[PDB]
Fold:
Amino acid sequence: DKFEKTMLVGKQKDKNWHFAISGASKLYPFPVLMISSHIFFTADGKKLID
Amino acid sequence: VSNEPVKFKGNVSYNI
Amino acid sequence: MRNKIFISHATPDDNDFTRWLALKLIGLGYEVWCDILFLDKGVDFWSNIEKVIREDTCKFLLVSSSYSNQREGVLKELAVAAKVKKQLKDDKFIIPLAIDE
Amino acid sequence: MRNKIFISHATPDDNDFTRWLALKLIGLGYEVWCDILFLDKGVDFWSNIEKVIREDTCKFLLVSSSYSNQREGVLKELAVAAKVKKQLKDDKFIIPLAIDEQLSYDDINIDIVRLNAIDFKMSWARGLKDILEAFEKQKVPKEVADASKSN
Amino acid sequence: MRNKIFISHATPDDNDFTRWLALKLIGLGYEVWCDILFLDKGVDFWSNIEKVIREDTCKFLLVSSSYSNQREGVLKELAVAAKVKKQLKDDKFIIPLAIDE
Amino acid sequence: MKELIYIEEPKILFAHGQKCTDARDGLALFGPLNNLYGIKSGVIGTKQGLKIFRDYLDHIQKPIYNSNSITRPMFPGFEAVFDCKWESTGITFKEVTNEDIGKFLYNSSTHKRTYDLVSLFIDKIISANKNEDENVDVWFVIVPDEIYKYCRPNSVLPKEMVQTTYNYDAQFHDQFKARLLKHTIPTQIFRESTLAWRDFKNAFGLPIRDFSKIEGHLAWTISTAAFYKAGGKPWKLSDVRNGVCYLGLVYKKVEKSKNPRNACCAAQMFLDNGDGTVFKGEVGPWYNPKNGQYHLEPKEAKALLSQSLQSYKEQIGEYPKEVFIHAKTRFNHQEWDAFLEVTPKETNLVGVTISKTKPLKLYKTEGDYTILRGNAYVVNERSAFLWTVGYVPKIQTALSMEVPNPLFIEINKGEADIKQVLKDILSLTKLNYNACIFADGEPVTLRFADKIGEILTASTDIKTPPLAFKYYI
Amino acid sequence: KFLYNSSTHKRTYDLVSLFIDKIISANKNEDENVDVWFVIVPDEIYKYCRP
DNA sequence: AAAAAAAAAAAAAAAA
Ligand SMILES: Nc1ncnc2c1ncn2[C@@H]1O[C@H](COP(=O)(O)OP(=O)(O)OC[C@H]2O[C@H](O)[C@H](O)[C@@H]2O)[C@@H](O)[C@H]1O
Structure:
């Protein structure tokens, strides 16, 4: 659960947390793809908490 | 699309 | 020469009446000594009080209250005033003031 | 000519109050010597401190707290200041400042347990105004107030 | 437990009385602490006396003379003795000894 | 590589003409601008709550020590900091009985319970202000914790606690400040938890709002609010060029009337003959029909800017030379043309759009710290980014918790120098009187205007609202 | 301007309005807090603004 | 009834 050397999916009590990103293309400043970072959680590692 | 993020350059820094 | 009036009192409690009386006497031309208004900071306060009572106190005014009757500092000042009374041979040296009903 | 005010205290615990008091007194025009005010340190400092207390100090303010009550450096400064006090034939030399509510007047250090102290326990500004009236009463040397020096 | 008897005095003038009284009391079985008793001095003594008057002294004896009456060290010892008297709530703590005619 | 320029950190003025980068440190050492002899304080609330307020006032009388003075300055004590006497003796107390405050609380309708709860306090406040000889500078309203739990929208009372107006907003604070406007009574609400929180306990046993490390800044931000609302000048700006009015437009929704009607609110900031600063609101709320227009119609726009040019004229004498209307919403040409006509020939009319939507996050190469506060990436002469939130060495930390988000500052209309515009908004970020922090994340015009908008849209029956911020924040 | 009016009622209403508008504007639109508002009136107005 | 490009109202936590 870690790309390169850096961990992306971790544990916190009974919640498995995952790093996620959202992308959006913008052209006004330059031809750019903007990325936003977020953290989500699952109870068993596959199903997201509702 | 480049996999390396756009880098800017700041003329001012700081230290702990 | 002695030209000061020492208003002994209970400092933690009797400040208001003592300050009022001291200001009234000063406005009347009477040189008055009192800790709350005349005592210098950073001095040997007990030694200063003893010196003032012994040499500069022409008259001694005691504020009598339910607090000041048994306050150790007030009693010590009172005893020094009594000794000065014996020295000066002035039966009317000390005048108590009763303010507490 | 002794025109400087000395402030003794506990450096790692009482630094903020001494900072405030020094930055206000200097703004008001009173020459203040304190260990915090000077930046950098060298072996000479302990000598310098002593000579100041014996050569340029006009008043000695001892910050009284549970930390500075029984600190060896503070005690050494108090002792040398007391010797200077006997030397100068001036009783109004040591002026303790009580800033601690857990340090009652009962447990003051023996060298200043007999001296009247300006009360900073309740309101700092009341103590500061008491300090100002005491200084003007004792004709402590003063310059025209300039907050620019403090800044 | 406080079991020492402190004898304050004017050091360079009251050597004889303090010496005689201390050598009598120690022989009588009473613990005695005094500055002339201890041989050699250091910077610590000014601190030491304080803690004694606050931690080991059970009775405080003040040699009263024209010298020791207004002696600064004697005055400081008297002040700390009076305040530890207040803290112990024991009025019969300071026992003055007048030796001057 | 893309060049990233940094603006000098703005400086604010304190007493004796002394300038300091920080606000807390400047107040602690130099003191307010004006002489406020004393704050006659009026307290209203339950008797159980008056003891806590008295305890806190005595607490702030003495200096307050925080965890780390380097991270945030300590509080030297109210009367020393502000040179103003604010004692716990002389407070005019109005009592609210527990039965009366509980009768209205347990109601099924949120609107009705909020209306009655607000009325219970405001009626007593008006009676004390109008029919009592005592003078009160400011009114502290201490409310209990259950009300706050059940006095704001979407608050569902437990079914067991239910025991038993629609033109008024369901928010306690908003309606409270709205219904007191016509009387001009400076009031400033306290919660019971914002008070001596140590009484309030959770299941674990820790205080819910544990402020153990952060008591000093709490005292700092309460004392400054009390000083401002009592009629004091805490600090002022010194870098603002003469002849510049700013004004900040904010659009708010009004749900009571059919369709939001998009009420707009504005605030002005300029100078005075001499060196005095003027920072008031411009409350003439100009309702904008249509659900989501957010563009002000020509007649209301002309009325707004005409009021703004006058309110400068009677107080300085002549018209401003350049007005910089900041606005969170983008200007269309329709309102801009209306603005232009009422604008005289000498005035430089500039319309600036500010936005936090742009997702730019500069991560420093190494180190667990954010970028320095004040960095500006200028895209072009009309548009740029400015990091209003970020690391500044004096606070020893960053003002954000995660990596902050910049302000996207673009000169929508007019010409304007981008560097000069970036050099002023950063100064507007420092004049936040409601909170004594190092600086605010957004300019105070866009924040105080939003505050007065949220207050003015709580009551429908507002008529000629006060233009002073004392009655709003 | 207001004072030299023939009608006593109109002139006194205008004189009162001139002061009250400024006082209300100061009370509502300024950050200063004023305990008591002193209204200084000259003698000519006193002579010609009462029944 | 979608798209992207812009809007505000609201509640929750964690620090400042
Ligand atoms: N370094 C100090 N040592 C003692 N007292 C001090 C000091 N600094 C301030 N005080 C103040 O001194 C006061 C001590 O009060 P007390 O003796 O217990 O009760 P009373 O009713 O018998 O006071 C009567 C005389 O004692 C006074 O000293 C005056 O000389 C009075 O004439 C406290 O307020 C202290 O804050």
